[PDB]
Amino acid sequence: GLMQFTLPVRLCKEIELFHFDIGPFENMWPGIFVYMVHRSCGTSCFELEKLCRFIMSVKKNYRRVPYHNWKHAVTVAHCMYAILQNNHTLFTDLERKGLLIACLCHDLDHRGFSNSYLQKFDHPLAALYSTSTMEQHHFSQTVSILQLEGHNIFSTLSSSEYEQVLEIIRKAIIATDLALYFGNRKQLEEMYQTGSLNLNNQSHRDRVIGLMMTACDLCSVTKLWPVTKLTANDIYAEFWAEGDEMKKLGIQPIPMMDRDKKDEVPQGQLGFYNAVAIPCYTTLTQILPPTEPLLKACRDNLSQWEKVIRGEE
């Protein structure tokens, strides 16, 4: 009960910032995550022995893929920690608990392929889940690990709190399906602007939690330029592998996923920042003003990609 986690001074300070990079030392990531739970949630939320066993089973069920890996899980959990810490009183005990676990679990057992490639391949997961295929699988994997013996970190909750937290986590994980982002942000935009947004309306809270999940999941675009640029290589390493597997099925991949069209990467980043990232953080900042630093950093990185095309780097 009296066992705190402490980070070194640089990490203790930089971890509160949105643009924090968790570093190349895999063995520190579990401790970084426990640190964030204790400060975000309390040292009482979870039984440390159960939490540590949950975390190491989650780590084990992420694959060695270039991007959709254990490092991404923890990066996304840190972005959610930063949002929750900058919006202290807006979220319930249950929500703070649920959302950090949802982030850690959001991409469990990812293979580095889009929902589209699973459909074109005719993967068994595509027969069992027709939409948000991987996302329904990630939530399924989460429930499996929670049911391993000694792994039920939620065991002190009541029957009803337990169903609530697993509903928060299910919705949170489904919302990381980017195909659902576009309609969700558009509805939030309308509700903010026509002034009907209501945080006490649970259908509204769900949408706002969904946008936070998209914001955390894309948070590679909100880092300092050198982190953003190097993470983009891992992202495109998966896109090009999927493109290779599309060509093997007898289908030209879209140019973003074709490794013969690397030249077109900078313009593909522009489209993605304008079409997805900037609108995501704009709406998020309108609803939760203390998340403005994510919008500022995203803008800085858009400007950095424009410089890449003007040959300035």
Ligand X SMILES: O=c1[nH]c2ccccc2c2nccn12
Task: Tell whether residue 176 is a contact of Mg ion (CB under 5 A).
Answer: yes
Q: Which amino acid belongs to residue 162?
A: Y
Smaller CB separation from Zn ion, 67 or 240: 67
Smaller CB separation from ligand X, 157 or 178: 178
DSSP string, 10-33: HHHHHTTSTT----S-GGGHHHHH
Smaller CB separation from ligand X, 35 or 272: 272
CB of 217 to Zn ion, least distance (A): 4
Task: Tell whether residue 304 is a contact of ligand X (CB under 6 A).
Answer: no
CB of 299 to ligand X, least distance (A): 15
Q: Which residue in the list 19, 38, 68, 138 is annotated as catalytic?
A: 68
Task: Tell whether residue 238 is a contact of Zn ion (CB under 5 A).
Answer: no
Instruction: Mark out the alpha helices in the chain (DSSP H runs).
Output: 9-14, 29-40, 48-61, 70-86, 93-105, 115-121, 124-128, 133-146, 159-174, 178-193, 202-217, 225-248, 265-272, 278-287, 292-309
Smaller CB separation from ligand X, 30 or 268: 268
Task: Mark whether 68 is an active-site residue.
Answer: yes
Closest C-alpha to 239, from 214, 264, 210: 264
**Who's near 202: CB < 8 A, 6+ residues apart?**
none
Tell me the window of 26-34, 44-52, 100-108, 192-200 that interacts with Zn ion (CB under 5 A).
100-108
CB of 134 to ligand X, least distance (A): 14
**What is each CA distance from 273 to 31, 218, 257, in whole angstroms?**
32, 10, 17
Tell me the window of 13-21, 23-31, 178-186, 217-225 that interacts with Zn ion (CB under 5 A).
217-225
Task: Tell whether residue 115 is a contact of ligand X (CB under 6 A).
Answer: no
Whole-angstrom distance, CA of residue 122 vs CA of residue 133: 12
Is-contact 280 218, C-beta < 8 A? yes
If binding means CB under 5 A, how many residues of this protein chain bind Mg ion? 2
Binding to ligand X (CB under 6 A): which residues in 166-225?
Answer: 218, 220-221
Task: Tell whether residue 113 is a contact of ligand X (CB under 6 A).
Answer: no
Is-contact 209 172, C-beta < 8 A? yes
Tell me which residues are annotated as active site.
68
The residues that touch Zn ion, with contacts defined as CB under 5 A, are 107, 217
The residues that touch ligand X, with contacts defined as CB under 6 A, are 218, 220-221, 235, 268-269, 272
